[PDB]
Amino acid sequence: QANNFLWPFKLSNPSGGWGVPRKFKHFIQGGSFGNREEFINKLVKSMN
Amino acid sequence: VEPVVVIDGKGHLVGRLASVVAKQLLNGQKIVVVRAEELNISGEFFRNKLKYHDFLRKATAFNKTRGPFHFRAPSRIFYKALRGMVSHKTARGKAALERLKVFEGIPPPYDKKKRVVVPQALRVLRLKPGRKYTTLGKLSTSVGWKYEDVVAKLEAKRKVSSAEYYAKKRAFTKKVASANATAAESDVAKQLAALGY
Amino acid sequence: HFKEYQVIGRRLPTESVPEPKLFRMRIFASNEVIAKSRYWYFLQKLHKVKKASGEIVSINQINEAHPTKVKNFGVWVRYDSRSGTHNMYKEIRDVSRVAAVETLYQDMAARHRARFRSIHILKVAEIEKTADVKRQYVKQFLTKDLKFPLPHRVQKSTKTFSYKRPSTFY
Amino acid sequence: AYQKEYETAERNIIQAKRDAKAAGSYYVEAQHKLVFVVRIKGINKIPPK
Amino acid sequence: AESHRLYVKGKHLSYQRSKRVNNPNVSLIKIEGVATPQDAQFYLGKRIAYVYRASKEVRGSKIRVMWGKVTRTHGNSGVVRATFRNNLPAKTFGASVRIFLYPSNI
RNA sequence: UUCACUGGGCCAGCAUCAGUUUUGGUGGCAGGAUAAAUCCAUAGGAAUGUAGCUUGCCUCGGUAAGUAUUAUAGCCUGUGGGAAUACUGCCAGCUGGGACUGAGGACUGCGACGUAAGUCAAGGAUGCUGGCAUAAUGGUUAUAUGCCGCCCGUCUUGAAA
RNA sequence: AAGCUCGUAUCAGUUUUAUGAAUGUAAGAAUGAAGAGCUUUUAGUGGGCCAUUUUUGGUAAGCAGAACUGGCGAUGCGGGAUGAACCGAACGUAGAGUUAAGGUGCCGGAAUACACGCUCAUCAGAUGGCGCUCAAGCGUGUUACCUAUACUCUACCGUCAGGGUUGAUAUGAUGCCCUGACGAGUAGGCAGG
């Protein structure tokens, strides 16, 4: 109920950048996609 | 930072020098390269001699007299290496090249005037120790240019006329070094030193 | 840049199988998540498991003991290639375990074109007593009172125009 | 009440981790029960599934 | 006696551009003796003037001025973005541009 | 008719603000081997063996054979103690510099601050100041400069043709 | 397009458990969606090619055929020097900020950045040109920067959706408003001028 009440967030592109040269690889091998576990906080705060 | 910036090819690298001289023009920075002949490239001689002749066989078909005019004179050899990075067509260019002046040797009215060097384009600061590297001079000679001699001689003369100068000067600043050395220590001095001078 | 991680796993305990064998190994990685990912890849090579069947029990950093003492690291490495995989031993004179494995990865890329995915680090061990140094280029620095110059110094000019004609003495 | 609750939550995770190393055991941390998913690729050339 | 200069002199390089598109609104300015973005941070917000002779006399002077502001840095060299009221003529690519010391942070 | 007060636009500068964002300086914490180190001790060890001592040798005290565990340098490992400091993370911490925007139009509402009276950065910019009528400003045409722009329409074929 | 029941538990290019020989049926499973079904009728439409993944037939090779999902078709924009098939990105008009893909010697906006090594080639190499050799090449890592019509915020235009508004509103209630979302387009359809 609380999640569905919240509208899907509209984030800007990250303030610093994505870090990586190429975005579309897994995070485990120098990309952006997939699970990043804890570093998502660093990413979303720049995207905020 | 100086209306004109006379440069001295002597011990440089066609490409790098050029390039940097290029930018300097497109940004309104008059220039004047000298000693052109005593310029430098990279790689054995037999090299640049080829990577050129090829540029020689060029020429247009029907009318060889209307094609790639192969300039021998170094100054030019280099001037090309440059006009190659400068739209040299759109007025913005023409406006440049119009800001250049590559001489072979060092003729007046510059002889008498300071020069400099583009530390980011020195054989001795880019080429790994002991490693083949042309010297335009020969290169030009080998392919036409009929004066390497004149400049040559007609050069040494310039170095003289000067060398002699320096002396007079050096012999002059030998005094100053003393004038102050003595007039040094006093007061008025001390103070300065404190502030830094 | 790298960090060293101590990872342990035990293929989730089932009925009549209480507390399994706990496979311990030291992993070099840039961060915690990559260390976990590499750990599963090594478990599947040594034996028959999967990521879903097991659990990461504890993942802890291992700081280097004395990062002010110059050591001699003798590293064993297994790595994939264009041909079949093959074992290797190299020697690195360095400060820490982490800096040693770092310079190894750069050297492996330089001389063999092997990326991080291709390389398994078998075992990193110090060489305490000299004369166990099998390589020449490491033994090279172990002579008494090594005094050498660094001639022909490339001095970086921030400005584009110099007025002195740079004389590269040292 | 929530400020006190979050504080005591993280402190009990810290304390449990400290108690494991002291007792020579291993504390499993609580399985992460919430993710935040951010779209990374555009609208086009995406498969149906 | 010689120097009445209360401005740092810098050249007008180009417009903000890609390979194939240029925005003429934002001009790129090289400033003398500025090497980094950190040194350029001082010059942010300072008023710029491009001073030039014209043919016809307008207000008892044959000299006209375009005024503008530094907006932000541009790359690692100390090249600086700059928006004027009326954009600079593009004929001035490589022309001297006077960067003043007002308004002062210091 | 005596006077006193006052001027409406347009474009700007500054001030305090508000929404967005960029770039600094600075402080307090919380994690880890309750950082690891270093350092202060302590007990062993070997050396790329320091002082000393022993022996072949000019070149003035020499140079490799030993001796020796540090002596007229030190190092390494262990053991114990004492603080830090990076690193990761947090602050509903503080203090700046720059750009862009000012939408809306009596008052209602959510609030903060103040004992109250009120006031405020709280349901979207106000205040001050300057430039004017031979103005200020704004436009048209002519070309120049930087960048970009395949010849329109119909009809085919998988689109170019 | 309209009318009729409903506005729901009506479903979904999805995952999960359950039950059989990638694959069938159910859930008091998750996640999303207030956009569903029943009539009734009305335009346009019968082009392939390339690529992907399974095979089937195959000798010097190439490939030949079948099925499956995309790309172009009806589609601009940033990048790949230039381009039907690559890379990024689905477009109202602007202002500011941040990025993608690709790059930062110069032409060319952006580091002649930092760090570890390797490479001398008598037409190296990565080449679009000039040019390059402790590179402007190769392998790799670390940051910094450049910019699209992409994302974020704000204004503005219009469209759609929800709503306020009378003992009448300091403007034609077929007015005056308040809130949010959206914007490519050929054949064709509807509507306002």
Curated annotation (Swiss-Prot), chain A:
The protein's job, in short, is: Component of the ribosome, a large ribonucleoprotein complex responsible for the synthesis of proteins in the cell. The small ribosomal subunit (SSU) binds messenger RNAs (mRNAs) and translates the encoded message by selecting cognate aminoacyl-transfer RNA (tRNA) molecules. The large subunit (LSU) contains the ribosomal catalytic site termed the peptidyl transferase center (PTC), which catalyzes the formation of peptide bonds, thereby polymerizing the amino acids delivered by tRNAs into a polypeptide chain.
Assembly mode: Component of the large ribosomal subunit (LSU). Mature yeast ribosomes consist of a small (40S) and a large (60S) subunit. The 40S small subunit contains 1 molecule of ribosomal RNA (18S rRNA) and 33 different proteins (encoded by 57 genes). The large 60S subunit contains 3 rRNA molecules (25S, 5.8S and 5S rRNA) and 46 different proteins (encoded by 81 genes).
Q: What is this protein called?
A: Large ribosomal subunit protein uL30A
* Gene behind this protein: RPL7A
What other note does the entry give for this protein? Answer: Present with 101000 molecules/cell in log phase SD medium.
Name the species this protein comes from.
Saccharomyces cerevisiae (strain ATCC 204508 / S288c) (Baker's yeast)
Q: Which family does it belong to?
A: Belongs to the universal ribosomal protein uL30 family.
Q: Please give the range of the full-length protein represented by this chain.
A: 197 to 244 of 244
Coiled-coil residue spans: none
List locations, semicolon-separated. Answer: Cytoplasm
UniProtKB/Swiss-Prot annotation, chain B:
Entry annotated with the keyword Ribonucleoprotein = yes
Per the record, the covalent cross-link Glycyl lysine isopeptide (Lys-Gly) (interchain with G-Cter in ubiquitin) lies at 175
State one Pfam family annotation.
Ribosomal_L13
Whether Acetylation counts among this entry's keywords is: yes
Q: Which Gene3D superfamilies match?
A: 1.20.5.4280, Ribosomal protein L13 (3.90.1180.10)
| CDD domains attached to this UniProt entry | Ribosomal_L13
Q: Which domain of life is it from?
A: Eukaryota
The cellular location(s) given in this protein's UniProt record come to: Cytoplasm
PTM? N-terminally acetylated by acetyltransferase NatA.
**What keywords is this UniProt entry annotated with?**
Acetylation, Cytoplasm, Isopeptide bond, Ribonucleoprotein, Ribosomal protein, Ubl conjugation
Protein purpose: Component of the ribosome, a large ribonucleoprotein complex responsible for the synthesis of proteins in the cell. The small ribosomal subunit (SSU) binds messenger RNAs (mRNAs) and translates the encoded message by selecting cognate aminoacyl-transfer RNA (tRNA) molecules. The large subunit (LSU) contains the ribosomal catalytic site termed the peptidyl transferase center (PTC), which catalyzes the formation of peptide bonds, thereby polymerizing the amino acids delivered by tRNAs into a polypeptide chain.
- Oligomeric and partner information: Component of the large ribosomal subunit (LSU). Mature yeast ribosomes consist of a small (40S) and a large (60S) subunit. The 40S small subunit contains 1 molecule of ribosomal RNA (18S rRNA) and 33 different proteins (encoded by 57 genes). The large 60S subunit contains 3 rRNA molecules (25S, 5.8S and 5S rRNA) and 46 different proteins (encoded by 81 genes).
Q: What is this protein called?
A: Large ribosomal subunit protein uL13A
Q: Which lineage do the record's taxonomy fields give for this organism?
A: Eukaryota, Fungi, Dikarya, Ascomycota, Saccharomycotina
Name the gene that codes for it.
RPL16A
From Swiss-Prot, chain D:
Q: Which UniProt keywords apply?
A: Cytoplasm, Ribonucleoprotein, Ribosomal protein
The terms under GO molecular function for this entry are: RNA binding; structural constituent of ribosome
Q: Which domain of life is it from?
A: Eukaryota
Q: Where in the cell is it found?
A: Cytoplasm
Provide the GO biological process annotations: cytoplasmic translation; maturation of LSU-rRNA; maturation of LSU-rRNA from tricistronic rRNA transcript (SSU-rRNA, 5.8S rRNA, LSU-rRNA); ribosomal large subunit biogenesis
Gene Ontology CC annotations of this record: cytoplasm; cytosol; cytosolic large ribosomal subunit
Spell out the subunit comment: Component of the large ribosomal subunit (LSU). Mature yeast ribosomes consist of a small (40S) and a large (60S) subunit. The 40S small subunit contains 1 molecule of ribosomal RNA (18S rRNA) and 33 different proteins (encoded by 57 genes). The large 60S subunit contains 3 rRNA molecules (25S, 5.8S and 5S rRNA) and 46 different proteins (encoded by 81 genes).
What family, per the record?
A: Belongs to the universal ribosomal protein uL30 family.
* Miscellaneous section: Present with 101000 molecules/cell in log phase SD medium. There are 2 genes for uL30 in yeast.
Q: What is this protein called?
A: Large ribosomal subunit protein uL30A
Taxonomy of the source species: Eukaryota, Fungi, Dikarya, Ascomycota, Saccharomycotina
**Gene expressing this chain:** RPL7A
Q: Which residues of the whole protein are included? A: 50 to 98 of 244
Swiss-Prot record, chain E:
Q: Which domain of life is it from?
A: Eukaryota
Report if keyword Ribosomal protein is assigned: yes
**Which Gene Ontology terms of cellular component type are present?**
cytosol; cytosolic large ribosomal subunit
- The UniProt feature for the cross-link Glycyl lysine isopeptide (Lys-Gly) (interchain with G-Cter in ubiquitin) gives its location as 46
| Membrane-spanning intervals of the chain | none
Tell me the keywords, alphabetical order: Acetylation, Cytoplasm, Isopeptide bond, Ribonucleoprotein, Ribosomal protein, Ubl conjugation
Q: Do you know which InterPro entries this protein is assigned to? A: Ribosomal_eL33, Ribosomal_eL33_CS, Ribosomal_eL33_sf, Transl_B-barrel_sf
The GO annotation for biological process reads: cytoplasmic translation; ribosomal large subunit assembly; ribosomal large subunit biogenesis; rRNA processing
**Record localization:** Cytoplasm
What modifications does the entry list under PTM / processing?
Answer: N-terminally acetylated by acetyltransferase NatA.
GO molecular function annotations of the record: structural constituent of ribosome
Q: What is its main location?
A: cytoplasm
Pfam families from the UniProt entry: Ribosomal_L35Ae
Q: What are the N-acetylalanine sites (modified residues) in this protein? A: 1
Additional record remark: There are 2 genes for eL33 in yeast.
As for what it does, the entry says: Component of the ribosome, a large ribonucleoprotein complex responsible for the synthesis of proteins in the cell. The small ribosomal subunit (SSU) binds messenger RNAs (mRNAs) and translates the encoded message by selecting cognate aminoacyl-transfer RNA (tRNA) molecules. The large subunit (LSU) contains the ribosomal catalytic site termed the peptidyl transferase center (PTC), which catalyzes the formation of peptide bonds, thereby polymerizing the amino acids delivered by tRNAs into a polypeptide chain.
The similarity annotation says:
Belongs to the eukaryotic ribosomal protein eL33 family.
- This protein's name: Large ribosomal subunit protein eL33A
Protein source organism: Saccharomyces cerevisiae (strain ATCC 204508 / S288c) (Baker's yeast)
